[PDB]
Amino acid sequence: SNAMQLTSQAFSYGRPIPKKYSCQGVGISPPLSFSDVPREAKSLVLIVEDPDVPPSVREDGLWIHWIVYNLSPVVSNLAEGAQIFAVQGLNTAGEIGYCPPCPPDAKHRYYFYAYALDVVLSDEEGVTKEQLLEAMDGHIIATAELMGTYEKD
Amino acid sequence: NAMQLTSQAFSYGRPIPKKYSCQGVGISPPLSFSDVPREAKSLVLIVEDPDVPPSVREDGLWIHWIVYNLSPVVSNLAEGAQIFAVQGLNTAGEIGYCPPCPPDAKHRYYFYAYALDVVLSDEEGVTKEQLLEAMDGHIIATAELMGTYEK
Ligand SMILES: [Ca+2]
Ligand SMILES: [Ca+2]
Ligand SMILES: [Ca+2]
Ligand SMILES: [Cl-]
Ligand SMILES: [Cl-]
Ligand SMILES: [Cl-]
Ligand SMILES: [Cl-]
């Protein structure tokens, strides 16, 4: 296509994420595919977040489930639970890496955002979303979005 | 449940019938959209030929059709349909569909459908570049159909 894509073999936009990738299954990271990445991209960034987190546990209403940056722009697929040859940032629990959906109160939406950058960012551990967004500023050449839902059954 | 774009006139990678080319009446081919996400507020269609002779078009890409602000429940466009959406500029410099008319070889014609989470502004003379620049940040699904033409 004419624009960068972020998709998953496991679910289409707005459909349920399989149980395997939630706290009700093994809780591993879902498969994701990047395609049509601009040739000028030098790295990719992934941010996964839940704007449906109960506000009584998170006042700003947004829980970050995964941060990955400095991915290769030709990475193509991340297989489920795969090794990440890139830098992982901090989720909202304050730990590195992927946190599975585990919505206590309702069905939630989980948004997966991809960003293509025309630079490689500094190699830093412990990166939060706020810090990452600052580092990206001025370097984002394209974005893509995927969303899936989860509701405990 | 991925979004799909199909045509009752040709399956993926197969020849586009003559009537949709310059060798016939040259009307737009029938198209069907399936499994458009619920969250979509509009559809976009971009049809282009990356096999255009580079001596004619240096960048190697000729746009044959741009449509945006299609209803997300439009479901199908009949052959040569009156379009209830906005048509943009093709590379010939005209609004609407330009048929395949490859002079030199078999070409591939790619049809890309995009579901957006917004309705774009109603504008005249919209080019592919302007359309794509506005779509970034709003695309929620993509589907591809391809057909070939050879004189
Ligand atoms: Ca007929
Ligand atoms: Ca004219
Ligand atoms: Ca109008
Ligand atoms: Cl995938
Ligand atoms: Cl959750
Ligand atoms: Cl059709
Ligand atoms: Cl042509």
Swiss-Prot record, chain A:
It comes from the Bacteria. It holds the Pfam family PBP. PANTHER family: PEBP (PHOSPHATIDYLETHANOLAMINE-BINDING PROTEIN) FAMILY PROTEIN (PTHR30289:SF1), UNCHARACTERIZED PROTEIN YBCL-RELATED (PTHR30289). Belongs to the UPF0098 family. This is UPF0098 protein CT_736. The lineage of its organism: Bacteria, Pseudomonadati, Chlamydiota, Chlamydiia, Chlamydiales.
